[PDB]
Amino acid sequence: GVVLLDGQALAYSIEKDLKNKIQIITVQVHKRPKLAVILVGKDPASITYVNMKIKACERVGMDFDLKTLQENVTEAELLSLIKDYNTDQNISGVLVQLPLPRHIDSKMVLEAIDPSKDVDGFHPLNIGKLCTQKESFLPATPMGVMRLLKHYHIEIKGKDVAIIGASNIIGKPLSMLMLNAGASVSVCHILTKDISFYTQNADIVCVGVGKPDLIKASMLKKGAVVVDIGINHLNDGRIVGDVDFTNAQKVAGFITPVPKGVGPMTIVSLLENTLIAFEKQQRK
Ligand code: NA
Ligand code: NA
């Protein structure tokens, strides 16, 4: 019997814990964790993502500051805003919604976030610490994937894991978390000659490239754990993953639905990182 990796249910359970911890903090020290969110421009999908993050903060009682900037904002203005958020002791985490406009150097803007407030885990200091087994902020999507697997008692150590997608924000950090946990890890992408070579061997397949039906049942090992990070908005309004869910469930042992699988876990991971940032700030 295949098991649904119910990321939505796990995220809601974690949110209940966050809400309770924040309630205690608010009464004990009369402060709350606070997330600063910067949105540049009016990209529809970016607006939706910002609203998802703000609504999540509201569900757990986390404070937030949403700063909306025009699409033609200068890099200097964005940097000056980030500097002020870095120095404001009442700001726990700082998040810049991506993508930024082409005239903005995204890597420079993200490196201006103080690493102690980098709740997205995108600062190279945090990425480098992850790669060298030093504790710091994990990117939210890989963090949520590992947390979901932990909840379902999926063993990582000694397992063969195939990661499809090699992005800086998902596939690469996820591969590092898997390796650090003792898996043998393959990272594939658009230039891979035969992804099925890697997926048919894998105990765990994680895919996040944005291509409907890329992962088919015939590409999987019987009993495999399948983590579908894709979120594809089809022309007709449907939202599907990168896995052929209907057929793959005939072979997989565990599988995330899309939507309501990895998505809610990414969001709750951002909330957890903001609380961690607050707690580390108070201890320092
Ligand atoms: Na300053
Ligand atoms: Na393990």
Tab-separated table of C-alpha atoms and ligand atoms in Angstrom:
chain	number	residue	atom	x	y	z
A	1	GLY	CA	0.000	0.000	0.000
A	2	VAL	CA	1.388	3.352	-1.116
A	3	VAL	CA	1.679	6.058	1.548
A	4	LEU	CA	0.823	9.684	0.817
A	5	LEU	CA	3.556	12.064	2.029
A	6	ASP	CA	1.015	14.540	3.391
A	7	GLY	CA	3.025	17.737	3.528
A	8	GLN	CA	-0.066	19.852	4.187
A	9	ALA	CA	-0.978	17.886	7.312
A	10	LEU	CA	2.604	17.948	8.602
A	11	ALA	CA	2.907	21.694	7.965
A	12	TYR	CA	-0.316	22.353	9.885
A	13	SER	CA	0.954	20.252	12.796
A	14	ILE	CA	4.237	22.190	12.853
A	15	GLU	CA	2.351	25.492	12.604
A	16	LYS	CA	0.445	24.581	15.772
A	17	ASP	CA	3.793	24.166	17.551
A	18	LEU	CA	5.108	27.480	16.207
A	19	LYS	CA	1.938	29.294	17.264
A	20	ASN	CA	2.295	27.928	20.800
A	21	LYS	CA	6.016	28.726	21.072
A	22	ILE	CA	5.459	32.288	19.841
A	23	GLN	CA	2.603	32.803	22.297
A	24	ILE	CA	4.971	31.866	25.121
A	25	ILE	CA	7.697	34.192	23.825
A	26	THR	CA	5.267	37.107	23.489
A	27	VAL	CA	4.205	36.793	27.128
A	28	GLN	CA	7.641	36.012	28.585
A	29	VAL	CA	9.842	38.608	26.849
A	30	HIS	CA	7.240	40.943	25.270
A	31	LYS	CA	8.708	40.475	21.803
A	32	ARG	CA	7.706	38.482	18.740
A	33	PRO	CA	9.700	37.088	15.833
A	34	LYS	CA	9.227	39.375	12.863
A	35	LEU	CA	9.777	38.659	9.168
A	36	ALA	CA	10.652	41.473	6.759
A	37	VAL	CA	9.451	40.727	3.215
A	38	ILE	CA	10.568	42.814	0.242
A	39	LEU	CA	8.573	42.628	-2.992
A	40	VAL	CA	9.871	44.459	-6.075
A	41	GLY	CA	7.357	45.065	-8.830
A	42	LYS	CA	3.991	43.476	-9.472
A	43	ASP	CA	4.649	40.043	-10.977
A	44	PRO	CA	1.375	38.134	-10.372
A	45	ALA	CA	3.011	34.902	-9.188
A	46	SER	CA	5.378	36.810	-6.893
A	47	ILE	CA	2.390	38.595	-5.351
A	48	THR	CA	0.776	35.196	-4.683
A	49	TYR	CA	3.956	33.883	-3.060
A	50	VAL	CA	4.293	36.975	-0.855
A	51	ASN	CA	0.676	36.584	0.255
A	52	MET	CA	1.252	32.914	1.091
A	53	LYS	CA	4.199	33.898	3.288
A	54	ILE	CA	2.308	36.716	5.043
A	55	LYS	CA	-0.764	34.557	5.662
A	56	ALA	CA	1.483	31.883	7.178
A	57	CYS	CA	2.990	34.464	9.541
A	58	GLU	CA	-0.543	35.461	10.527
A	59	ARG	CA	-1.554	31.853	11.241
A	60	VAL	CA	1.255	31.448	13.801
A	61	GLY	CA	1.236	34.956	15.301
A	62	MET	CA	4.529	35.991	13.742
A	63	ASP	CA	4.909	39.691	13.014
A	64	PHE	CA	5.857	40.869	9.539
A	65	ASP	CA	6.730	43.973	7.543
A	66	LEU	CA	5.847	43.953	3.841
A	67	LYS	CA	7.765	46.541	1.823
A	68	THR	CA	6.549	46.933	-1.760
A	69	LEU	CA	8.907	48.669	-4.176
A	70	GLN	CA	8.331	49.778	-7.740
A	71	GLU	CA	9.755	47.640	-10.520
A	72	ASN	CA	12.144	50.493	-11.426
A	73	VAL	CA	13.620	50.709	-7.903
A	74	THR	CA	17.355	51.319	-7.842
A	75	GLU	CA	19.821	48.809	-6.475
A	76	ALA	CA	21.094	51.473	-4.071
A	77	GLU	CA	17.633	51.954	-2.568
A	78	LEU	CA	17.148	48.198	-2.177
A	79	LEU	CA	20.564	47.848	-0.518
A	80	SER	CA	19.827	50.729	1.876
A	81	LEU	CA	16.544	49.099	2.897
A	82	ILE	CA	18.257	45.762	3.541
A	83	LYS	CA	20.916	47.511	5.640
A	84	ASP	CA	18.219	49.036	7.841
A	85	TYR	CA	16.472	45.681	8.245
A	86	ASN	CA	19.827	44.104	9.152
A	87	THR	CA	20.397	46.655	11.907
A	88	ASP	CA	16.843	46.713	13.319
A	89	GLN	CA	16.943	44.396	16.329
A	90	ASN	CA	13.175	43.932	16.061
A	91	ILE	CA	13.564	42.309	12.614
A	92	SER	CA	14.315	38.599	12.941
A	93	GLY	CA	14.432	37.506	9.302
A	94	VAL	CA	14.771	39.261	5.966
A	95	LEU	CA	13.375	37.788	2.749
A	96	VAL	CA	13.563	39.237	-0.770
A	97	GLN	CA	10.942	37.806	-3.104
A	98	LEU	CA	12.444	36.492	-6.329
A	99	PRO	CA	12.773	37.140	-9.206
A	100	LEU	CA	14.187	40.637	-9.081
A	101	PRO	CA	14.233	42.905	-12.154
A	102	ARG	CA	17.021	42.379	-14.655
A	103	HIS	CA	18.661	45.734	-13.854
A	104	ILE	CA	19.247	44.542	-10.259
A	105	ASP	CA	22.211	42.297	-9.438
A	106	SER	CA	20.316	39.591	-7.534
A	107	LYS	CA	23.402	37.869	-6.139
A	108	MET	CA	24.693	41.163	-4.716
A	109	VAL	CA	21.326	42.066	-3.189
A	110	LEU	CA	20.988	38.670	-1.541
A	111	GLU	CA	24.559	38.801	-0.228
A	112	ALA	CA	23.680	42.118	1.448
A	113	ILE	CA	21.200	40.343	3.747
A	114	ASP	CA	22.923	39.645	7.023
A	115	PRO	CA	23.523	35.865	7.203
A	116	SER	CA	21.998	35.840	10.714
A	117	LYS	CA	18.660	36.958	9.203
A	118	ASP	CA	18.838	34.936	5.963
A	119	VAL	CA	15.707	32.845	6.442
A	120	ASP	CA	15.734	31.753	2.782
A	121	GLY	CA	19.243	30.318	3.198
A	122	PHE	CA	20.339	32.055	-0.012
A	123	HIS	CA	23.369	33.871	1.354
A	124	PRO	CA	26.578	32.194	0.126
A	125	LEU	CA	27.960	32.068	3.677
A	126	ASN	CA	24.983	29.940	4.701
A	127	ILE	CA	25.210	27.784	1.573
A	128	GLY	CA	28.904	27.240	2.222
A	129	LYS	CA	28.240	26.296	5.847
A	130	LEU	CA	25.632	23.759	4.725
A	131	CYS	CA	28.137	22.287	2.278
A	132	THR	CA	30.766	21.942	5.055
A	133	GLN	CA	28.474	20.542	7.791
A	134	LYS	CA	28.251	23.711	9.881
A	135	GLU	CA	24.837	24.551	11.303
A	136	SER	CA	23.103	27.554	9.766
A	137	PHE	CA	19.962	28.488	7.840
A	138	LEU	CA	18.817	25.858	5.365
A	139	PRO	CA	16.946	26.855	2.187
A	140	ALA	CA	13.272	26.403	2.851
A	141	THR	CA	12.386	23.879	0.127
A	142	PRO	CA	15.220	21.405	0.900
A	143	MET	CA	14.629	21.926	4.616
A	144	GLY	CA	10.964	21.040	4.221
A	145	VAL	CA	11.742	17.966	2.134
A	146	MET	CA	14.101	16.556	4.753
A	147	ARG	CA	11.595	17.357	7.510
A	148	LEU	CA	8.828	15.566	5.615
A	149	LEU	CA	10.998	12.473	5.133
A	150	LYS	CA	11.934	12.533	8.831
A	151	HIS	CA	8.266	12.617	9.862
A	152	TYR	CA	7.604	9.476	7.788
A	153	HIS	CA	10.711	7.715	9.201
A	154	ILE	CA	12.336	7.414	5.774
A	155	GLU	CA	15.923	6.302	6.232
A	156	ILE	CA	18.522	8.347	4.343
A	157	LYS	CA	21.806	6.818	5.512
A	158	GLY	CA	23.231	4.336	3.026
A	159	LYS	CA	20.396	4.902	0.547
A	160	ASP	CA	20.667	5.753	-3.135
A	161	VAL	CA	19.070	9.115	-3.885
A	162	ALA	CA	18.430	10.743	-7.270
A	163	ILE	CA	17.887	14.519	-7.392
A	164	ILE	CA	16.417	15.742	-10.673
A	165	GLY	CA	17.102	19.457	-11.000
A	166	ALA	CA	20.351	21.203	-10.054
A	167	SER	CA	19.239	24.689	-9.055
A	168	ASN	CA	21.031	26.816	-6.502
A	169	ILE	CA	17.832	27.092	-4.399
A	170	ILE	CA	16.557	23.476	-4.485
A	171	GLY	CA	18.598	20.711	-6.097
A	172	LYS	CA	22.107	21.629	-4.989
A	173	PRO	CA	21.303	22.307	-1.290
A	174	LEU	CA	19.004	19.272	-1.206
A	175	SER	CA	21.844	17.125	-2.574
A	176	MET	CA	24.080	18.430	0.197
A	177	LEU	CA	21.537	17.640	2.921
A	178	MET	CA	21.147	14.136	1.492
A	179	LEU	CA	24.910	13.578	1.323
A	180	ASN	CA	25.387	14.939	4.851
A	181	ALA	CA	22.770	12.394	6.011
A	182	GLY	CA	24.758	9.545	4.442
A	183	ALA	CA	23.013	8.963	1.119
A	184	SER	CA	24.780	8.275	-2.157
A	185	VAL	CA	23.496	11.124	-4.289
A	186	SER	CA	23.134	11.697	-8.018
A	187	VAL	CA	22.234	15.124	-9.380
A	188	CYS	CA	20.652	15.233	-12.836
A	189	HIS	CA	19.295	18.020	-15.022
A	190	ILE	CA	18.373	18.992	-18.590
A	191	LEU	CA	21.710	17.729	-19.963
A	192	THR	CA	21.519	14.254	-18.388
A	193	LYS	CA	21.635	11.555	-21.053
A	194	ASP	CA	19.407	9.051	-19.237
A	195	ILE	CA	17.734	10.143	-16.018
A	196	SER	CA	16.019	6.744	-15.757
A	197	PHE	CA	19.424	5.136	-15.170
A	198	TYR	CA	19.626	7.086	-11.920
A	199	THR	CA	15.953	6.978	-10.945
A	200	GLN	CA	15.475	3.224	-11.426
A	201	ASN	CA	18.313	2.603	-8.929
A	202	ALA	CA	17.102	5.135	-6.385
A	203	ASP	CA	15.453	4.513	-3.051
A	204	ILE	CA	14.414	8.195	-3.021
A	205	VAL	CA	13.700	10.368	-6.079
A	206	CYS	CA	13.296	14.132	-5.614
A	207	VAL	CA	12.332	16.074	-8.728
A	208	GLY	CA	12.006	19.813	-9.121
A	209	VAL	CA	12.369	21.055	-12.681
A	210	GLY	CA	8.902	22.213	-13.753
A	211	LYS	CA	8.034	19.643	-16.389
A	212	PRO	CA	4.723	17.752	-16.062
A	213	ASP	CA	4.980	13.946	-16.202
A	214	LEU	CA	8.780	13.924	-16.357
A	215	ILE	CA	8.961	11.149	-13.744
A	216	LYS	CA	6.974	8.127	-14.864
A	217	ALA	CA	6.203	4.942	-12.950
A	218	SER	CA	8.502	2.931	-15.251
A	219	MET	CA	11.428	5.097	-14.091
A	220	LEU	CA	11.018	4.100	-10.439
A	221	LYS	CA	12.199	1.294	-8.214
A	222	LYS	CA	9.349	-0.646	-6.628
A	223	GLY	CA	8.779	0.866	-3.184
A	224	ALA	CA	10.635	4.111	-3.957
A	225	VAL	CA	10.036	7.333	-2.054
A	226	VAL	CA	8.977	10.039	-4.518
A	227	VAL	CA	9.234	13.731	-3.591
A	228	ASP	CA	7.617	15.987	-6.209
A	229	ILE	CA	8.845	19.572	-5.843
A	230	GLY	CA	7.424	20.713	-9.178
A	231	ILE	CA	4.469	23.087	-9.214
A	232	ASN	CA	3.220	23.412	-12.798
A	233	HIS	CA	0.299	25.715	-13.566
A	234	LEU	CA	-1.249	24.214	-16.689
A	235	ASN	CA	-3.067	26.252	-19.325
A	236	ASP	CA	-6.468	24.976	-18.169
A	237	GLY	CA	-5.852	26.038	-14.552
A	238	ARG	CA	-4.788	22.672	-13.149
A	239	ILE	CA	-1.707	22.451	-10.938
A	240	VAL	CA	0.360	19.291	-11.402
A	241	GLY	CA	3.790	18.158	-10.291
A	242	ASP	CA	6.737	16.793	-12.221
A	243	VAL	CA	5.623	13.217	-11.419
A	244	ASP	CA	2.888	11.252	-13.174
A	245	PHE	CA	1.191	10.825	-9.802
A	246	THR	CA	-1.717	8.625	-10.909
A	247	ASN	CA	0.517	5.956	-12.460
A	248	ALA	CA	3.582	6.369	-10.228
A	249	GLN	CA	1.544	5.501	-7.132
A	250	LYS	CA	1.264	1.941	-8.528
A	251	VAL	CA	5.025	1.460	-7.978
A	252	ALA	CA	6.098	3.994	-5.346
A	253	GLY	CA	6.065	3.185	-1.654
A	254	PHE	CA	5.644	6.853	-0.663
A	255	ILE	CA	4.657	9.837	-2.800
A	256	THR	CA	3.943	13.548	-2.309
A	257	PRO	CA	0.785	14.925	-3.939
A	258	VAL	CA	0.904	18.192	-5.844
A	259	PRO	CA	-0.460	20.593	-4.690
A	260	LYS	CA	-0.449	20.208	-0.863
A	261	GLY	CA	2.803	18.237	-0.574
A	262	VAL	CA	6.180	19.970	-0.648
A	263	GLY	CA	4.574	23.419	-1.008
A	264	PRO	CA	3.206	23.796	2.536
A	265	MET	CA	6.472	22.386	3.890
A	266	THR	CA	8.467	25.103	2.134
A	267	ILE	CA	6.274	27.740	3.756
A	268	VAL	CA	6.466	26.278	7.263
A	269	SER	CA	10.253	25.976	6.912
A	270	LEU	CA	10.449	29.726	6.336
A	271	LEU	CA	8.441	30.260	9.529
A	272	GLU	CA	10.730	27.907	11.450
A	273	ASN	CA	13.821	29.695	10.140
A	274	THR	CA	12.406	33.044	11.261
A	275	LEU	CA	11.800	31.685	14.772
A	276	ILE	CA	15.326	30.219	14.818
A	277	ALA	CA	16.704	33.598	13.737
A	278	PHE	CA	14.789	35.291	16.560
A	279	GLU	CA	15.928	32.759	19.165
A	280	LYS	CA	19.601	32.961	18.143
A	281	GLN	CA	19.389	36.762	18.177
A	282	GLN	CA	18.035	36.738	21.750
A	283	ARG	CA	20.782	34.399	22.971
A	284	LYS	CA	23.469	36.610	21.380
B	1	NA	NA	23.592	51.716	8.709
B	2	NA	NA	18.865	8.256	8.143
